[PDB]
A paper describes a structure:
In a subnanometer-resolution cryo-EM reconstruction of the binary Dcx:MT complex, we clearly observed a DC core at the Dcx binding site. Strikingly, in our new structure we found that linker regions on either side of the well-defined DC core adopt a significantly different conformation in the absence compared to the presence of bound kinesin, providing important insight into the Dcx-MT interaction. In the Dcx:MT binary complex (top), the pre-DC linker region shows only diffuse density, demonstrating that this region is flexible when bound to MTs, as it is in solution (Kim et al., 2003). Crucially, in the absence of kinesin, there is clearly post-DC linker density docking along the DC core (top). A distinctive feature of N-DC is the presence of W146 in its post-N-DC linker, which has been shown to dynamically dock against the N-DC core (Cierpicki et al., 2006); point mutations at this residue cause lissencephaly (Leger et al., 2008) and defects in intracellular transport. Flexible docking of available N/C-DC structures—including the post-DC linker—into our cryo-EM reconstruction confirmed that W146 apparently contributes to docking of the extra density against the DC core when bound to MTs. This observation strongly supports the idea that the Dcx density observed in our reconstructions corresponds to N-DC. Our data show that the region of Dcx bound to the MT corresponds to the N-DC (R1) domain. Interestingly, in the absence of motor binding to the MT, the post-N-DC linker region of Dcx is clearly docked on the MT through W146, which is consistent with previously reported results (Cierpicki et al., 2006).
Numbering used by the authors:
A (entry chain G), D (entry chain C): 2 to 44, 47 to 360, 369 to 437
B (entry chain F), E (entry chain B): 2 to 37, 47 to 439
C (entry chain I): 51 to 156
């Protein structure tokens, strides 16, 4: 099987560097080097993310889409930056304006064809394609607009292969932009109707989870990114490993989406202990479920405790008892019968790889489909209206060839999306 | 990628020489042009040894541009790029815009079309002018004017030094500034503002010195500006393009004018004291005594701030220091704006003049923003105008220079809707 | 003395609020009370900035003066707030104020 | 079986360091080290006080509750201080004011939830929980108030598991504080109605017993503490050892409490001889009962000779004849028929471990439930009234959100408690 | 955890320089700020290599604060933290509180809000003033005043040097001290008192020297004070927080004023004599000739004492030495108070000036307490007042300074109920 990553925008891009920083080491691939793999198993399934050309050069099969040179020229001028074949860099030296409209209708719409071109060169690579990974932020141009287009096109070209989306939904407390809800509401819209698996991460849900669950005092972006990339590795790549009970994107999809919206999840990693001290090793297993299922530790902003779950997928990856795994999951399902929805006898989807995260003994990625994420699109949707009402920075959109009915559309859509999700919380 | 710059008016040129100084100073390029892309968005690698500037200089009296071609830096620019009109400056808009200023413009443009070509996919022109002057108000007025048409497809961020609230110089100043605002308004992308007087306070209160030479205020803006282009167009952990600004900074087409502010302003001689915390500098940003503008947040609700940091800064430190702020409430942000905080993080710490009077910290915050505050500053400057116009005062000086009762009265009405604009976009929910 | 009150956060239906004491010697005004309430009710789910205003149990009117706070009262924290209104809180005993009930000889 | 110690306040804390200083050696557990145990028996039952994580790191399962950093930061910065998992430290950097009200209603009430949290993490450790050990002083904030709360909550969470309380009731002659009877009367109140086994120690009953029964001329606190900790080791831990006739907290409880008040005891150690000289070894056994049953040697302030006993528990721990033990106890019960209450044919509860205190040949902890302790709560209760009457330092309580009826309550309650206890002395 | 300090009035500043001296002296921090948490509750680690002061200095004449920025220690504080009002001091409350003193307060506060922020969960402000002065009585009056409102949620222990019983200085003194008492009364937590004259006795009778420079009395309080904050906020066998005090020390809301006392006051040159016993020093504490206050326990029943010990002390030694006392009866403690003995044990012994005149023992007892005794001291100081007010004496000096017949007469009535208060809480059962 296979997949082809997609680094839309700067963020989605910045993260690319971290997702590939990791993944590679979790596959023994040095900058341009080959497979130094401490083992021999980190190779029989690599294909999922690379391509064979030389014999020591397995190149990441991702796409780097962005209308701001400097960015990709920071990712390509640093560490692992020199492993991507230049063909991968689909830049847009234009003005990468922070407008969803500027990267979806006017500026991005041009650079698109020169992207799809490659997304096809990579898809028609070889063997059988599974789906595409998509990273980006719903709070900017090259991210929400142009990346949200990249998919609307992808999903017309292969409505068969899957589409996981890793979105950095606009953090609450403080937004890293001003129109944010504009660029956001507009991209979520496109999401709820193309990709079929979205993993929403919040820069501040991370800080928290990174400053209190990792006594880490100076959580640089690199970190946040690093933590995130840690989860997306547990998801995909991982399951493309052996296991007593293994799954793969689809299983994950076909066990997690009760209703076609596409629904968005909230990823959570397992061993998340501070370096030295904490290295408690309390990782027998009840310790991992202890972790994963708590409020804090959910990369999302919202707290599960604020709304039932529809599905859950503990994708563990480290030798354990299909008994102490299958078992724990249960008590968990009974101690919290309250929030776990009922019309699904077994919400949880236990998954079990074998080999764990390179240096760790036992981990377990969590992919939750809780109704709690209602209380986020609400947020976003609110911010919109409060500012849409006055058409705040709307001239930067319309003046870019947009529509007063376009914004209406998205909000509503994504706004209805909130509605539905409640239809199950009850 | 790049951003040309047109320093217009003696002042815009003095400030220019300054901002231009700080530059090489933090790029290891001696005044001889030679250093031993990155920063190419402000310097062209002409010949095979040098670093010819990436801007131009426009004054109608030679005096001031002359001094540049005397003092080291003399070697820095191209003999060509420093435009002059031996003729007369005239502290009057009209003459500088219409009558005289006209003659030079072509030639002026030519360079910003000759320098705009040589490059590689540019982003815009950082314009440097002094609102209340002759060559600075008038001229530019039509320079930016002729730009908005020749390159509507770019950024027009004009960095102005608008009229000291009580310590103005020219007798007419307002005539010249109500006129540079109305003519440039429909042409700029984002107009940065640095108040000459409100900067003195900083030199008195936050650095201590009753001996502030113009050469200092210049070192200051010369700093805040370095935080804009220089370092930003320079790689970092959270890059921010020029476009980025206007996008994340202007809510509405009016060439909106944010305010420049810097965090660490502390005098050398203090240079040894234990440095300030990420939290303190952040907080210093919300103090109306450190903002290079006599527009004390007397009520003006911020509506978007671009916190450009530089030096050793942990993104969480920021995505926390800002969080703390977002909840101080006494800092009331506009309604229609959930989050209006563009966090720009650079790497390389600031770079203080070897021995001026600037502390020299290992991190700073050049936060700029649009604040419903200027509702004031414009008001107080508009009123001025009327008083004189109300009696025609120095009107005969413009009329006789190819202007009319029109341009004045019709540029007054102009700003009028700038007093209503900056009022409506705020104060209301 | 002071005034015993049970402070709930608007839109929670889970957290049973936190009990605070309020007087002229502890808090010079509602802004000072609200300042400490931001620390004690500090959150990011039910309360945007932790605590900016205090509303009646039903959310019909917000208090602006300490003189409106009665003993054994029930209040809600808001910041918009938009009201659900979330009641909730129930149920708890009024024993936070005082135990109405006692033991009995069963 | 198991238990989870609780170091409430500074005192209760200071003592923690001594109770664990000891106990560990009585279980071969070095600072962070493991079981160096001279034997193999000091391990089959450790669980009662530790947890398995590493394999050399059996960490004490106690709680350190205190609103004064410096304290726990003295216990954590000294000897065995680095064995407690940091998670154990439930500090309250607030102003640990010396007010019962400040650590029970205003300041402590906040830090409570962050405690109960852990008291549950430790309870739900493993196997089966027996009860919790509680150390503190009834003459301060973090001690009487906040610790007296910790239990009122514990006893609502597991009204099944037991609750031994080690209280440092306010010594007579001189009070090491001023409001003492305030912080005290208020905590005893909470005790008589939650914990079901209390061992009251008196800093001056110790001095005495430590300056005349140990020619010790400079009895530092460390000592007193040390002596106390010696008794609480004989009690618990001990009985969790084999024995011809062994008991355990309950036996101790179910043989010592005739009436539900909870009743408080007065612990007494056996071999209490000065170092060099005295090392008389007159420890055949009549020598231990000689000891234990004398007036002086009762860690309590009051003297048994001043009031009958209801129950007694000689918890011996050193190879001896179930005959010379069971026998002695008798004569003792007949030479003093006077004071030993009659409606209990056999007041005494003989208990007999095997292994003795590490370096000793034969010892025997004494846990007396004598009616004599009436003459102590009297004391306390007196001090109250004499000062309550004038509301002495009452503003420090009320001003902290208290009640004029709260103080009334406690005194009465604890005051009645005096009454009852006499109902048997007669 | 910490406790800021505001030394107000020349005196409060002289005493300040002193108490501030003893500090570094026993913390190995040379006058250069550098030493080669623990004590962080009084010093901020500005980085960095330095320490700086965790306090401020307020005088309306420069003279006295000036001298600090001359003599080594010059390096210790921040050039900023030493507030001055070049204007006029005026040995009159009114002027210092109202009229002049007002102008500075804001600024003053700013530091105790700027220094109060920088820290980590503080506990309060140890205030240092000289009751009968202009800048010391008046000013503070409103400083403590503005504190009780801005931080009602903390400790306000003001360390005063109230009027020598017969050896006063200022002619008005009482006017200034009946006024600092009434205005601060409803704002302080615990007011420590050290009588200037009654300290001389100690210098004559318990150290022998008819040459006591102010610089000495300061070394003394500079000692007793070190026993309060310094060492106490410092780990030990029986720690005692600041809150602890007010709690274990004030029976009633009146900002009650205990008295400071020290045990080992013996002159160097005696320095070799066999040291005193734990029992002797303990006993020395109950002698009305060693208490830094002319309030000889002429009848005043103690109602709470905080025996702060430091050095090598066995808790039993104390919990015995005190027992012996509790039964001396001639030391009669209040009725409503069973036990009123807060035993505070520290480790590190005292630290005497290298070569002043203080013995230098290996253990001391800084016992402070509330004694029905001050019923006197206040009385005798109140009476004073009347005599003059009875004739208005220097009244025109205050009136003309924004005061009225009100503030005097109404602050007299104030203390009146302080003569009844300190009477009722005792003498009766
Ligand atoms: N910060 C700063 N402000 C300056 C400087 N030089 C002048 N100004 C201010 O800019 C205005 C002066 O403009 P002028 O120098 O009179 O005129 P000009 O704009 O150069 O053009 P002409 O009127 O034709 O000479 C006044 O408000 C000055 O306070 C300078 O070097 N730095
Ligand atoms: N112990 C001690 N007492 C002092 C010292 N300096 C002054 N005093 C006493 O404090 C009072 C003097 O206050 P002043 O110096 O007159 O005034 P001030 O309080 O500094 O403020 P202003 O009147 O405005 O100058 C007298 O009672 C002095 O005996 C000192 O260094 N140590
Ligand atoms: N986790 C994370 N968030 C990022 C990174 N970079 C930008 N962001 C977030 O992305 C949003 C801004 O959008 P941006 O990526 O600049 O948009 P674009 O570059 O124009 O497509 C803000 O909410 C940031 O917090 C990153 O490297 N990691
Ligand atoms: N045996 C003993 N008593 C102590 C110790 N520390 C304080 N005490 C006693 O505890 C009482 C004071 O309460 P304290 O522990 O300071 O209260 P808290 O710290 O505010 O909770 C006094 O009666 C002291 O004799 C100690 O280490 N051992």
């Amino acid at each position: 099987r296979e997949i082809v990553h997609i680094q839309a925008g700067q963020c989605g891009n910045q993260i690319g560097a971290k997702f590939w920083e990791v993944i590679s080491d979790e596959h023994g691939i040095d900058p341009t080097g080959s497979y130094h793999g401490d083992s021999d198993l980190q190779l029989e399934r690599i294909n999922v993310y690379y391509n064979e050309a030389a014999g020591n050069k397995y190149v990441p099969r991702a796409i780097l889409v962005d209308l701001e040179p400097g960015t990709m020229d920071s990712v390509r001028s640093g560490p692992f930056g020199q492993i991507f074949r230049p063909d991968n860099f689909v830049f847009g030296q234009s003005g990468a304006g922070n407008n969803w409209a500027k990267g979806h209708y006017t500026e991005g719409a041009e650079l698109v064809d020169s992207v799809l071109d490659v997304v096809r060169k990579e898809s028609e690579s070889c063997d059988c394609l599974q789906g595409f990974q998509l990273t980006h932020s719903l709070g900017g141009g090259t991210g929400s607009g142009m990346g949200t287009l990249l998919i609307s096109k992808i999903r017309e070209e292969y409505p068969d292969r899957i589409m996981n989306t890793f979105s950095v939904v606009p953090s609450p407390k403080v937004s890293d932009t001003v129109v944010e809800p504009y660029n956001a509401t507009l991209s979520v819209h496109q999401l709820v109707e193309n990709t079929d698996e979205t993993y929403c991460i919040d820069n501040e849900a991370l800080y928290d989870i990174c400053f209190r669950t990792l006594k880490l005092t100076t959580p640089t972006y690199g970190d946040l990114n690093h933590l995130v990339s840690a989860t997306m590795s547990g998801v995909t790549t991982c399951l493309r490993f052996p296991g007593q009970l293994n799954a793969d994107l689809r299983k994950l999809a076909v066990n997690m989406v009760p209703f076609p919206r596409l629904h968005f999840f909230m990823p959570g990693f397992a061993p998340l202990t501070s370096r030295g001290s904490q290295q408690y090793r309390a990782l027998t297993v009840p310790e991992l479920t202890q972790q994963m299922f708590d409020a804090k530790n959910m990369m999302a902003a919202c707290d599960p405790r604020h709304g039932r779950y529809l599905t859950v997928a503990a994708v563990f990856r480290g030798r354990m008892s299909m008994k102490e795994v299958d078992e724990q999951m249960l008590n968990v399902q009974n101690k919290n019968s309250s929030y776990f929805v009922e019309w699904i006898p077994n919400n949880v989807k236990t998954a079990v790889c074998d080999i764990p995260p390179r240096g760790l003994k036992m981990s377990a990625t969590f992919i939750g489909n809780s109704t709690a994420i209602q209380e986020l699109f609400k947020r976003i949707s609110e911010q919109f209206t409060a500012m849409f009402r006055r058409k705040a920075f709307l001239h930067w959109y319309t003046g870019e060839g947009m529509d007063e009915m376009e914004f209406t559309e998205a909000e509503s859509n994504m706004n209805d999306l909130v509605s539905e999700y409640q239809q199950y919380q009850d | 990628r790049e951003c040309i710059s047109i320093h217009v008016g003696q002042a815009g040129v003095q400030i220019g020489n300054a901002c231009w100084e700080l530059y090489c100073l933090e790029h290891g390029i001696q005044p001889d042009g030679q250093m031993p892309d990155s920063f190419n968005t402000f310097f062209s690698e002409t010949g095979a040894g040098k670093h010819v500037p990436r801007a131009v200089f426009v004054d109608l009296e030679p005096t001031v541009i002359d001094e540049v071609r005397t003092g080291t830096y003399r070697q820095l620019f191209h003999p060509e790029q420093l435009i002059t009109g031996k003729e007369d400056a005239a502290n009057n808009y009209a003459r500088g815009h219409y009558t005289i200023g006209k003659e030079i413009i072509d030639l002026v443009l030519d360079r910003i079309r000759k320098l705009a070509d040589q490059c590689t996919g540019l982003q815009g022109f950082s314009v440097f002018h002094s609102f209340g002057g002759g060559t600075g108000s008038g001229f530019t007025s039509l320079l930016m004017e002729r730009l908005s048409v020749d390159y509507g497809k770019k950024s027009k961020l004009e960095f102005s030094i608008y009229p000291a609230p009580q310590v103005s110089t020219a007798v007419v100043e307002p005539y010249n500034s109500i006129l540079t605002t109305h003519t440039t308004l429909e042409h700029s992308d984002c107009a940065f503002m640095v108040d000459n007087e409100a900067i003195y306070d900083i030199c008195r209160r936050n650095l201590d010195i009753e001996r502030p030479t113009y050469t200092n205020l210049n070192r200051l803006i010369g700093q805040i500006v370095s935080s804009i282009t220089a370092s930003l167009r320079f790689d970092g952990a959270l890059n921010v393009d020029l476009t980025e600004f206007q996008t994340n900074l202007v809510p509405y087409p009016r060439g909106h004018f944010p305010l420049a502010t810097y965090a660490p302003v502390i005098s050398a001689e203090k240079a040894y004291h234990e440095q300030l915390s990420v939290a303190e500098i952040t907080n210093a940003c919300f103090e109306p005594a450190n903002q290079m503008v006599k527009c004390d947040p007397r009520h003006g609700k911020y509506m978007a701030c671009c916190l450009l940091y530089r030096g050793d800064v942990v993104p969480k430190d920021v995505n926390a220091a800002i969080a703390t702020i977002k909840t101080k409430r006494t800092i009331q942000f506009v309604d229609w704006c959930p989050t209006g905080f563009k966090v720009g993080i650079n790497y390389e710490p600031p770079t203080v003049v070897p021995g001026g009077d600037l502390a020299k910290v290992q991190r700073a915050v050049c936060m700029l923003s649009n604040t419903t505050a200027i509702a004031e500053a414009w008001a107080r400057l508009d009123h001025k105008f009327d008083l004189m116009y109300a009696k025609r005062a120095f009107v005969h000086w413009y009329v006789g220079e190819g202007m009319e009762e029109g341009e004045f009265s019709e540029a007054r009405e102009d700003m009028a809707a700038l007093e209503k604009d900056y009022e409506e976009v705020g104060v209301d929910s | 003395k002071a005034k015993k009150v049970r402070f709930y956060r608007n839109g929670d239906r889970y957290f049973k609020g936190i009990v605070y004491a309020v007087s002229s010697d502890r808090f010079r005004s509602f802004d000072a009370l609200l300042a400490d309430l931001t620390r004690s009710l500090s959150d990011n789910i039910n309360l945007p900035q932790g605590v900016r205003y205090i509303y009646t149990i039903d959310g019909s009117r917000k208090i602006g003066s300490m003189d409106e706070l009665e003993e054994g009262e029930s209040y809600v924290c808001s910041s918009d707030n938009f009201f659900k209104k979330v009641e909730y809180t129930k149920n708890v005993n009024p024993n936070w104020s005082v135990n109405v009930k006692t033991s009995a000889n069963m």
